[PDB]
Structure 1
């Protein structure tokens, strides 16, 4: 896979962000994770975690997997990086997302993220507390 440039337009919630990609505004949904909705337990904390990560970054990148690049709602499906750190992985490592929505052929980073989830669960963090 390849990292490609993007710039932040606006934080949305734990697992969606509005970015400019190839010069066009797009909502991205993060691959292989699920954060609680803002109205659920840990939802606000997930939203804040992602917001801080993308707003503080100097360099935002997106990385598409091998399969579908947009979902049925028109959201881009990617792994998102903030100063080289994967947001998808960071959310799972902190117990603020579950590994989820693992579809065949868009699952390159599945085992990296399951390893993070096991570590967050071991530490009893957030969702796993």
Structure 2
């Protein structure tokens, strides 16, 4: 996989963010994770976590997997990195997202994220508390 540049337009929630990519505004949905909706428990905390990570970054990058790059709603599907740290993973490691939506051919970082989840769960963090 390859990292590509993007810039933040606006944080949205725990697992969606609006970025400018190749000069065009797009909503991205984070691969392989599910954060609670804002109205659900840990939703606000997930929103806040993602917002802080992307707003504080000097450099946002997008990394598409090998499969589908957009979902049926037109959202980009990618791993998102903030100053080199994967937001997807960081969410899972902090117990603010579950590994989820693992579809074959867009699952390159599945094992990485399952490992993060196992550690979050062992720590009894957030969703696992």
Q: Secondary structure at the match of 1:28?
A: strand
The residue that corresponds to 1:72 in the other structure is: 72
Shift of 1:97: 0.0
Shift of 1:15: 0.0
The residue that corresponds to 1:99 in the other structure is: 99
Shift of 1:70: 0.2
Residues in 2 aligned to 1:104 and 1:110: alpha-carbon distance in whole angstroms:
10
Shift of 1:118: 0.1
Shift of 1:66: 0.2
Consecutive unaligned residues of structure 2, counting only runs of 5 or more, are none
Residues in 2 aligned to 1:15 and 1:26: alpha-carbon distance in whole angstroms:
14
Normalised by the length of structure 2, the TM-score is 1.00
Kindly report structure 1 stretches of 4+ aligned residues shifted beyond 2 Å.
none
The residue that corresponds to 2:117 in the other structure is: 117
Normalised by the length of structure 1, the TM-score is 1.00
Shift of 1:30: 0.1
Question: How many residue pairs align between the two structures?
Answer: 129
The residue that corresponds to 2:35 in the other structure is: 35
Q: Secondary structure at the match of 1:70?
A: coil
